[PDB]
Copies of this chain bind each other. A is one copy, B any other.
Amino acid sequence: LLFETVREMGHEQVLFCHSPEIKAIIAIHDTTLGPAMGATRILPYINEEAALKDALRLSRGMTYKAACANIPAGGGKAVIIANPENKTDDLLRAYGRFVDSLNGRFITGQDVNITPDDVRTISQETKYVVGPAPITSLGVFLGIKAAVESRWQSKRLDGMKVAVQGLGNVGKNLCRHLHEHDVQLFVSDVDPIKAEEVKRLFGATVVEPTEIYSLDVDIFAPCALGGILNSHTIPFLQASIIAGAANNQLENEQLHSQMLAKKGILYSPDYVINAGGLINVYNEMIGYDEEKAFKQVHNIYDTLLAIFEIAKEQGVTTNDAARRLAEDRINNSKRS
């Protein structure tokens, strides 16, 4: 059961940890480019097969999210079967012992149900924990430029039309960056108060949440929601390029990427642009150095041009291109 699935996904090892009443699973996909990175996640899973399958899927994800980003790191993930109501400090300290067992092979972080104060509780026993908006925002701003180069052939963003979902800190900083390079903005937020501020600050024309998909614009930049590029709303896209900071953008990676491809729209992969958030966490592991971190995010620019180049030469989607680019980077890395 377990071993067959590993053959299809390509994981390195899987720990089933137990004791402080614990039911926890660390899963480690690869450690080729560095030590495996992946956040701790507490959920009350239906059964252990469900717990395992969530641990295998996301761990894989981190391998690909690290490789594209060009950080020396692998893909891991750690999960715990428990109800959020059922917790204590000892359970996290016990879980802390387990990441420490791995001796820095597996470096963890925060995910759903693991608060930053929890991360501290874990930290004392282990020391392999870690814990953003402006770098994520700049990562897109680079990703946007990178995407312009593929089709349009210029680096001047002057007189280009763009649309943004989400005026959260991560998303609004993008408006700032765009406005300051003479870009015309359309803006969308789920609540009324934040949308009004941006109007005042940058002279962006506020729209309702539902209108933004169809606008006659060059670029579309979603920064608040996942599952937006879907057969319902995806037909209305007039945007030539799709670069945004939000995660899980495609409802269905395989289906809805082809929808965009076949209709001539360029999709910058969500998890390559979101990587600014990961490169932030990476530096904290190795001791934070702003000088370097602000360089390391320029990988998104280099990475994406290649993904679009690879998409064309091979005759294939950006998502398939992103895999081959991630994969070949790991394969080639065996010499060093």
Residues of A at the B interface (CB closer than 8 Å) are 1-3, 6-7, 11-19, 23, 48, 81, 98, 101-103, 105
Contact = CB atoms under 8 A, between A and B. Distances in A.
A299 B130 CA distance: 46
B6 A16 contact: yes
Protomer copies: 2
A2 B105 contact: no
A91 to B, nearest CB: 15
Contacts of A15: 13-16
A330 to B, nearest CB: 14
Contacts of A18: 3, 6-7, 11-14
Contact of A101 (B13, B16, B98): B13
Contacts of A102: 101
20 contacts: A1-B48, A2-B16, A3-B18, A3-B23, A3-B48, A3-B81, A6-B16, A6-B18, A7-B18, A12-B17, A12-B18, A12-B19, A13-B18, A13-B98, A13-B101, A14-B15, A14-B16, A16-B16, A101-B102, A101-B103
**A-B complex: 6 closest residue pairs judged by Cβ atoms:** A14-B16, A103-B103, A13-B17, A6-B18, A3-B23, A15-B15
A6 B195 CA distance: 54
Nearest to A18: B6
A184 B105 CA distance: 60
A106 to B, nearest CB: 10
